[model samples]
Structures are given as C-alpha cells and as structure tokens.
Target: GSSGSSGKNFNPPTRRNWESNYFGMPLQDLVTAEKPIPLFVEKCVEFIEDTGLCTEGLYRVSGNKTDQDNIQKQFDQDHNINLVSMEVTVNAVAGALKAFFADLPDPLIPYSLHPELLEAAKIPDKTERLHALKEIVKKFHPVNYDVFRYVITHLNRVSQQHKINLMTADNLSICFWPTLMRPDFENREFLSTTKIHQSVVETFIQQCQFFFYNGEIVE
Candidate 1:
C-alpha cells in the first residue's frame, strides 16, 4: 500500500520543556534562603502595606502533602522560615507570613469579642464606645490581650510608615482595617460583612497607642 501510494515518511524530534524538566535546586538549599521568621514577618508585612496589597499574590499553598509537610516541619521549629526555593517569589514571603498568622489559634482581633466590638462600633457617642470597648478588652484572656496589644502596636508603626508613603488617615482604612480585624468564615456576621467602617479604623488609630502605653489589660 505504501509503495503504491508513494507515501512520504516523516519523523519529529520532541521538544523539551526546560522549566518543566528543571530540578537542580535542592530543597535544603532553597529553604535556607529564607530569613528568620521574625524578620521575615516584618518584611512580609512591610511588603504588603508598602504595596497596598494583601495575601492575594504570587505565593500559594501547593496543596501537595510533601510540600506542606516540609513547610510545617520548619514552621513548627519556631520563628524560622524554611519555605524558600530557588525562584523565591515575594508572594511566597507573603504566603509564609499569612500562614504564620493563620497558625494562631485566635484571630488578631479576638473573634469572640467581634460582636461586642461591632456593637461598640454602632454607638453614636465616641466616649461611650471607648468605654464599652475597654470593657471588652478587660475580658480578653491574658495571652490574647497581650497579643492584641502587641500587634496593634506594630500596626501603629505600620500606619506611620503608610502615612509617610502618602496614605493619609482618610485613605488608610481600606488598606489596614482588614489587616487589623482579619475576618474569617468561622466568625459571626459582624466580621463576615464585606465593609468595615472607617469609624472603626479611626477608633483603633486613636486608642491603640494609649491603650498599650497605659498597660490597660484588666485583671
């Protein structure tokens, strides 16, 4: 049949996927590129705030069990980042910071107090609202209260940096409100809302300094 039809025979060489086939960087070498966790956290937060961005970026959870385990093994070792790779993207740094925060058993704003905090937010009187909010802070478990103060203090510095970057108080709410409140699916409707009012951010900006400086945690 071939002879009768005078068919032409042809061969094609397969093209190689350089990126797909590349595996030169070892995991150990890659992981070592990461900074210490504390410094990395600062860098990650700085990058996000500086860029007016959030976790929706380059890095992501591979969802592969092996990758997850490698990260967790280093994560569990305390304040050390071993999630690095040869092509270490900024998103990976952001993702690592995100994972660090997510690992906390409690929300940054204390999910349990979200309702009371929201209720305080509704009060037309600022003085009365601060009083009520202070009451809520008094009720925080000592550790949670301490963590809240510490993080807010950090954010205060972040806000100043942001202001220097030209994000005025009027414009700061959108970038920082969620960074402070950090709502998640498990929280109540108050936190689940898409909008967090500027009033809330203003309150935090004004009060967080005095609150922490005064060591306001109640027995």
Candidate 2:
C-alpha cells in the first residue's frame, strides 16, 4: 500500500546542470587574446556559415526543443563537442547560437552603452550616423567589440543569401535586435525603444563592411 502524503518530506528540485556553465557567462570572461570570441560562439557560427545559411528560415524559425537542449548540454559540459558529426538540424544550431546571446549576463551591447547606441541610430545623416556608431563601438570592451564584429560580419553574409533564405538585413535585425540590446528595466517606454534597436542592428548588418573594414560611405 502507498504511504500517505501528510508527513512526507518534499525535496526541492536541484539546480539546472548547465546554468553555471558556459552559455550564460559574461562576455569578457569568455575570451582570450588569441580567441577573441569564445570557442562555443566560434564553433556555432562556423557551423552555421558552412551549412545553415541556405536553410529556408535561418534564424527566424525556432528549432526542436529537445535537440537544442541536447546541443546546449553537450557544449556546456564540453566546449569541444563537434556540430558537424552530430545528428541535428541547422535550425537547432541557429537556435542554440541565439540562445547563447539571450542567456548572457550582460547583453553584447551592454546596458551602460545601450542608450547611446540607440541615440546614434537616430542620426539622419548616414555619414554622421556611422561615425557616431563607430565611436561608440570603439568604447566597447575589446572582447565584446571583436565578438560583435565577427557576428555581424557573419550576419552580413547570411543576408547576402536572402534570395534563398529569405532572411534579409531587416529580417535578421528583427530576430536579433532585442537579444543584442534591451532596457535594463521593464517599463512602458521599453516597448517604444524596439524600433530604435531594430534600426541599429539593421545598420550593423547592412553596413558591416563600412564599420569594420574601413569601407567608404557613399553619402
């Protein structure tokens, strides 16, 4: 016969195994001089660049939860886990990479710089806008700056494939802007700032060459 629940001791659930591991760590803590981006980010982006760009929805579609969880667990436990040899979908890998940014202790743009970046996005003059953004980007922690450059450069290539993937600069920005920058506090004004973030990220993707490669602005 089953015992009654009246006097039973209920054990609290244990913390998630991967919570303390790499996915949610600070950006500055995850880089080294030789590897400006964390290996986890490097691997995920490398895999996507090699194989995922042609996928119909790319970053817009969510991946399978169980597959994505397994991917996270594997990487959290061991940074060397190879995505190429695994049985997983491209969308799952894309989702895992997106999850990494979403899980950061501080956003890629950092809360302290968010307002300034948003303001720069509002500059109507193209040359002045790029100049303002470039100056603020110079102020980023070196690791954050490098990682942002790398990710946006990769996104620029993905957008180049929009004819096949249908993920244009604007579309990719819509998926990524909120993850990259957001208000530290939740308030009524939070919703109003979305378009600003989107504009900034779209510029970051469409003009990555200008920002990162010393390319000229035509205007």
Candidate 3:
C-alpha cells in the first residue's frame, strides 16, 4: 500500500479492443480481417490433426478457378510430373498458399500487398489475376479449408484499429466492389472498373465460403 496515494483503487487504462471499438471501417471489412489466412490454415490443420481418422486417408485435390481440365493441364505442364498421392499434394498446396498470405507484402503475392489504393485502371486484367491465382493454388494444391473470409477480416481489423486509416464501405476499392455484384446484376445497371474487381474478389470470397460452409445458408 502507498502511503501518499491510495494504490488499491488504481485502475489501468482501458485498452481498446477491435470488437468493442467503434471503428470507422465498414462491418464487412472488419468481419473479414478477424480470421487471417495463417490463423485459418493453422485452425484447419489443427482440426484435421485432431481427427486421426480423417487425416489418415486424405488425398491431393486441385482448386482451379477455371476448370478441372485446366488444373490438370497446369500440373502436367508446370510440375512435369503426375501427382501420385492426393493426400500429400493437397496438404502441400494448402500449406504453401497459407504461408504466402501470412505476409501480404511477399513479392510472390500479386497486387503488391495493398489491394486497396491501387490504380485498378493500370493493374492486370481480371482474367490474368484469376489465372495467376489459380495457377498458384494449383502449385500449392488443395488446402484443408477455404481461407478468404479469415483473410479479409484480418486486413480490415488492422486498418480499423488505426483510427485514421480505417476504410469505410464507401472507401472500398472500386475494383473490389463489382465482383460482389451477381452475374444477373440488374439492380446496379451502371458499370465501372471497380465493379469488375469486386466481381472477382466476391466470387473468390463466395467460393471460399462455399468450400468451408457448403453455402447452405447462402442459398
């Protein structure tokens, strides 16, 4: 006990948490960043490891954005060898991509780490980005789980934590918005470059969600 000042009642300053903090970023961004890819991969590996039975008979699988045939061709073209074991291939592919995303600025990661604030008008075409992404996935092989949501949430959380840097829904990169629109997007008839990127990102997000949750709720 302090003689001059009462030490017993001293309360530490509150450390603001992401959950309780009124961040300036949009809810979607905040939600996505909560689950970083590495964390997601670790969790997936943990879940698989915990299940001795499922892990025993795992197999190699391809995650192709285009089609299965394309993925097959890619494997043969790039690796120059047939993937004999599905179990081994899937784990490797998933692990590689998981490792890559841990550091968004990794040179291997396209878009130079910041998908936002990039000049989409001068960026690679959607098809090119999609192709590259799929090729990387093919090389990585089939991961244990889809990690998109976890990635998004983590990114958003970081931005939100910094009051000045938080990105609102409106601030969402234009390219990232279009992908969120559906193929039969009749509501917003007008189109822009942002919408195209949005369409791609959203498709990826939806695919990841479907892979993990089976998209039962989506329908």
Top candidate when judged by lDDT against the true structure: 2
Candidate 1 stretches with Cα past 4 Å from truth are 1-95, 109-111, 166-198, 212-219
Compose the digit string of candidate 2's lDDT tens values, residues 1-219: 897676657688678545664445566666667877877677878888787578877788865778788888887777678899895788888888878777887778766787888889999888888889988888887877888888888888878888988888889988886788655565675446456777888887787888768776522
Provide the TM-score for each candidate, comma-separated. Answer: 0.46, 0.82, 0.23
Q: Where is model 1 poorest over a 10-residue stretch in terms of lDDT? A: 18-27
The most accurate candidate by TM-score is 2
Candidate 3, residue 7: how far the Cα is off, in Å:
28
A best-first ranking of the candidates according to their lDDT comes to 2, 1, 3
Per-residue lDDT for 156-218 in model 1, tens only?
A: 554455434444333444454555556556657553464445666556655665554653422
Evaluate model 3: give its lDDT: 0.34
Q: Whose lDDT is higher: candidate 1's or candidate 2's?
A: 2
How much is the lDDT of residue 182 in candidate 2? 59
In model 1, residue pairs whose N, Cα or C atoms come closer than 3 Å (at least 3 residues apart or on different chains), thus clashing, are: none
